[PDB]
Amino acid sequence: WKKIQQNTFTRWCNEHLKCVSKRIANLQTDLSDGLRLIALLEVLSQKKMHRKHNQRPTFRQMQLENVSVALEFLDRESIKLVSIDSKAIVDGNLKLILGLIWTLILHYSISMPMKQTPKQRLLGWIQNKLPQLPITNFSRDWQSGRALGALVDSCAPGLCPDWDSWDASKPVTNAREAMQQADDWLGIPQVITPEEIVDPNVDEHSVMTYLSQFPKAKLKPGAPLRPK
Amino acid sequence: WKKIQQNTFTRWCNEHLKCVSKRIANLQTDLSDGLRLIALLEVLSQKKMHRKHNQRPTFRQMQLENVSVALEFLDRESIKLVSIDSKAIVDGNLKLILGLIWTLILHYSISMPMQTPKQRLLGWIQNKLPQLPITNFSRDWQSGRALGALVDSCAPGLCPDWDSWDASKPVTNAREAMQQADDWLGIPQVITPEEIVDPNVDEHSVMTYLSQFPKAKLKPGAPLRPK
């Protein structure tokens, strides 16, 4: 079940990298040369790098430099780093790499758009989107798939009109339906999969990554809105 | 372990879709409207579609039409379809969807560049590694030794000491070989180190990955050592 956080963090990375025709396949290895780490940072910040880097990182000494300029750009952008050095990324320390990406997710996806920590800001935003439901956390409250259907219909009434009378004992079916409509007609990509979000062992961080896409979603023209 | 084939087939799809700034996340659902299926076919064939499709597939009747034009283009391109209809893709039949993608992998990745396409790829690897007895696309690759041999065969210097690698460290060997192949040969990891060494890996997933080797190009800055 610890795969879920890695999978969600990778999908989030690829969703930004695809705008520059680039892609990673393995968070452990594909950021080590620093090339695709810089690319990710440049597209997220909409800014170029402050100094030049090695185009051909032959030896790890050049890989350390490429990650250094990435960490410098991150530091001069007021983004707080929770003890991650260049060596950790180059040598492929998976635990600290996942920590680096989450820092990026918190800063760019959660706190940059919408007195209080970014976590309770997102919870606060969902809270009044769903006033009839008692939402407190980013895990168990979403396991049935009912709350996803409620959220998707809240953003555009008609996508999931009968969310209330959904079978709570069919979690994957409910989640897949809600996230399908959200992807097709709100443009919210599945950085987390239906099977993963309902899984009894989901981490809050993975679910937060997915839900952070909802405040800035736009309803598409051809959407099938029914009242049922 | 049945996840491996789905994961490899999805990664293969995303490796082509990324050239048109597009991406799928779920092979079961993300091809059902037919929009990203057409996109995948257009980039693979380097040709546009023969007739126009629904930009806004509101109801499944329009989703069926979008997949129909995708299947028509596939049919008029002499690509043999092993019993897959529009309904199967739209309704999200995972088994038949994986069959549809494998058809595309066989035609575009294996048989279009370089007897059946399977033994063609096996034949190509065979003389790249004449000192090794390769027969299959599964157990022969579990140690990670053969991957290191293949990567060094394509560019002598990337994995010079593959011969004296510890066979009891499969994931470590596989990760090293596939790392060098990605960085300096431009072969993306459509399959991950942990998946290729897995005792229950299917031949189809491994074939998908290895089909990228015949057309690989050595990058200028590669660290080639003799050891």
Swiss-Prot record, chain B:
It comes from Homo sapiens. It is found in: Cytoplasm, Cell cortex; Cytoplasm, Cytoskeleton; Perikaryon; Cell projection, Growth cone. It comes from the Eukaryota. Belongs to the filamin family. Disulfide bonds: none annotated. Comprised of a NH2-terminal actin-binding domain, 24 immunoglobulin-like internally homologous repeats and two hinge regions. Repeat 24 and the second hinge domain are important for dimer formation. Filamin repeat 20 interacts with filamin repeat 21 masking the ligand binding site on filamin repeat 21, resulting in an autoinhibited conformation. The autoinhibition can be relieved by ligands like ITGB7 or FBLIM1. Filamin repeats 19 and 21 can simultaneously engage ligands. Changing K95R: Abrogates ASB2alpha-mediated degradation without altering ASB2alpha binding. Homodimer. Interacts with PDLIM2. Interacts with RFLNA and RFLNB. Interacts with FCGR1A, FLNB, FURIN, HSPB7, INPPL1, KCND2, MYOT, MYOZ1, ARHGAP24, PSEN1, PSEN2 and ECSCR. Also interacts with various other binding partners in addition to filamentous actin. Interacts (via N-terminus) with MIS18BP1 (via N-terminus). Interacts (via N-terminus) with TAF1B. Interacts with TMEM67 (via C-terminus) and MKS1. Interacts (via actin-binding domain) with MICALL2 (via CH domain). Interacts (via filamin repeat 5) with SYK; docks SYK to the plasma membrane. Phosphorylation extent changes in response to cell activation. It is linked to Periventricular nodular heterotopia 1: A developmental disorder characterized by the presence of periventricular nodules of cerebral gray matter, resulting from a failure of neurons to migrate normally from the lateral ventricular proliferative zone, where they are formed, to the cerebral cortex. PVNH1 is an X-linked dominant form. Heterozygous females have normal intelligence but suffer from seizures and various manifestations outside the central nervous system, especially related to the vascular system. Hemizygous affected males die in the prenatal or perinatal period. Otopalatodigital syndrome 1: X-linked dominant multiple congenital anomalies disease mainly characterized by a generalized skeletal dysplasia, mild intellectual disability, hearing loss, cleft palate, and typical facial anomalies. OPD1 belongs to a group of X-linked skeletal dysplasias known as oto-palato-digital syndrome spectrum disorders that also include OPD2, Melnick-Needles syndrome (MNS), and frontometaphyseal dysplasia (FMD). Remodeling of the cytoskeleton is central to the modulation of cell shape and migration. The lineage of its organism: Eukaryota, Metazoa, Chordata, Craniata, Vertebrata. Ubiquitous. Residues 3-109, 115-218 form the Calponin-homology (CH) domain. Promotes orthogonal branching of actin filaments and links actin filaments to membrane glycoproteins. Anchors various transmembrane proteins to the actin cytoskeleton and serves as a scaffold for a wide range of cytoplasmic signaling proteins. Interaction with FLNB may allow neuroblast migration from the ventricular zone into the cortical plate. Tethers cell surface-localized furin, modulates its rate of internalization and directs its intracellular trafficking. Involved in ciliogenesis. Residues 1-223 are annotated as: Actin-binding. There is a cross-link at K2, K3, K95 (Glycyl lysine isopeptide (Lys-Gly) (interchain with G-Cter in ubiquitin)). This is Filamin-A. The chain holds residues 41 to 278 of 2647 of the full protein.
